[PDB]
């Protein structure tokens, strides 16, 4: 039960640049390692076998080498499709041990988000509960902040955020900030806005709506 550890986890590297990730076995595995590219969703795919031999059908970009403990999956040129969570497997031992999973993020040119606000539907208002959904769409980098303001009053300790695993076609992240609020409190207020703060935004530009106006 040799434990394989991958250092580090977030490896964001600009396109064309070499992304070099590690995997340190507890025991010695003597050039008996494997590397995988498990893109968001897709079941893992073999990359390097025998800790060196690049599998056929995979580009030379991936060049693996090391023995015993020091393992390094190298990527001489980085692309948008290369955004994936990577795995190292030992096969010295009969079972097969895996690593943590080094996520590689393609470093992109900073582009600001296209923000949209979502007032609740009357079907959800029938159920009592109401949800306001601030939508930040396709921006770089993942690092962004979403705040709230029901009648300017910042709604804290309530908003649930959800972010998308970086895009292939553009290398951008998109996030949702769902805000749950019961009809009784929802009706008592009119001002509704999510405040946006990002590296693209010159100043934090917020999109707002009022309960009555539709």
């Amino acid at each position: 039960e040799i434990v394989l550890t991958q250092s580090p986890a977030t490896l964001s590297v600009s396109p064309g640049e070499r992304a070099t990730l590690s995997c340190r076995a507890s025991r010695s595995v003597r050039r008996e390692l494997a590397w995988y590219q498990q893109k968001p969703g897709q079941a893992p795919e073999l990359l390097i076998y025998g800790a060196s031999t690049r599998e056929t059908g995979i580009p030379a970009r991936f060049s693996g080498s090391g023995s015993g403990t020091d393992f390094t999956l190298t990527i001489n040129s980085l692309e948008a499709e290369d955004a994936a969570t990577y795995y190292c497997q030992q096969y010295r031992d009969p079972p097969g041990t895996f690593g943590g999973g080094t996520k590689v993020e393609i470093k992109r040119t900073v582009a600001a988000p296209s923000v949209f606000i979502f007032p609740p539907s009357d079907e959800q208002l029938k159920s009592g509960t109401a949800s306001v959904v601030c939508l930040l769409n396709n921006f770089y980098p993942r690092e962004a902040k979403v705040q709230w303001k029901v009648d300017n009053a910042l709604q804290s300790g309530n908003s649930q955020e959800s972010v998308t695993e970086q895009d292939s076609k553009d290398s951008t992240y998109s996030l949702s900030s769902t805000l749950t609020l019961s009809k009784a409190d929802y009706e008592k207020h009119k001002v509704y806005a999510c405040e946006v703060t990002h590296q693209g935004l010159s100043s934090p530009v917020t999109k707002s709506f009022n309960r009555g106006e539709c």
Binding site: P44, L46, G50, P95, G96, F118, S121, L135, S174
Partner: protein, 222 residues
């Protein structure tokens, strides 16, 4: 073409049981040591069980040993894994894989099956509320516009979501599964189209949370 496909699981109450059933063609199945590898929610891959290219050899994971049973039907090119006394922790996506490292090399994992989700939850299945979310301004003035479908309350996690039957693609973002205070899961499916094309395509999200035997379609109106 190699086609390993882990068939189906779901959500079983702790201590239950459930038969998994990987399936593959596009290679002579009777030649390889096929095997299952469960994967935690965010964690890494963890090999669970392994069967020989003969059937007369089963190899189990330290803990799983004596609860899950691996089987192969090399006549009907099939792989199975039946669970029993399912502990809470086994909530994983169970992948299957062929393991030919050949003579030169021990055990490499050539191809991986789609991998189905098997969850062990004390909680019960819950149908999804589909509310259509759209703005207060039909005329936005910005030629880029957005509308969605708040898939409000579901369980367990698997819920297929697409738009325009499957025609809308450029702009469709299906948000990851979000846990709630209640315990229910939620996801929002959004799409970015033009402001001019408000009534050029009927924007309709097709929601399908297969576990509750539901299917909900919604044309985002008003």
């Amino acid at each position: 073409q190699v086609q390993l496909v882990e068939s189906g699981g779901g959500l079983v109450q702790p201590g239950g049981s459930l038969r998994l059933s990987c399936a593959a063609s596009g290679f002579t199945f009777s030649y390889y040591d096929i095997q299952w590898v469960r994967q935690a929610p965010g964690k890494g891959l963890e090999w669970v069980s392994s069967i020989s290219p003969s059937g007369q050899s089963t190899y189990y994971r330290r803990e799983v040993k004596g609860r899950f049973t691996i089987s192969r039907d090399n006549s009907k090119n099939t792989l199975y894994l039946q669970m029993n006394s399912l502990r809470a922790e086994d909530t994983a996506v169970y992948y299957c894989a062929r393991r030919t490292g050949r003579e030169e090399g021990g055990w490499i994992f050539d191809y991986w099956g789609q991998g189905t989700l098997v969850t062990v939850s004390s909680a019960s299945t819950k149908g999804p509320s589909v509310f259509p979310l759209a703005p207060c301004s039909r005329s936005t003035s910005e030629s880029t516009a957005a509308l969605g479908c708040l898939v409000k309350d579901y369980f367990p996690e698997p819920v297929t979501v697409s738009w325009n039957s499957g025609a809308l693609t450029s702009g469709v973002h299906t948000f990851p599964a979000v846990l709630q205070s209640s315990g229910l899961y939620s996801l929002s499916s959004v799409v970015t189209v033009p402001s001019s094309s408000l009534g050029t395509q009927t924007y309709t999200c097709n929601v399908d949370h297969k576990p509750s035997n539901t299917k909900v379609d919604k044309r985002v109106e008003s």
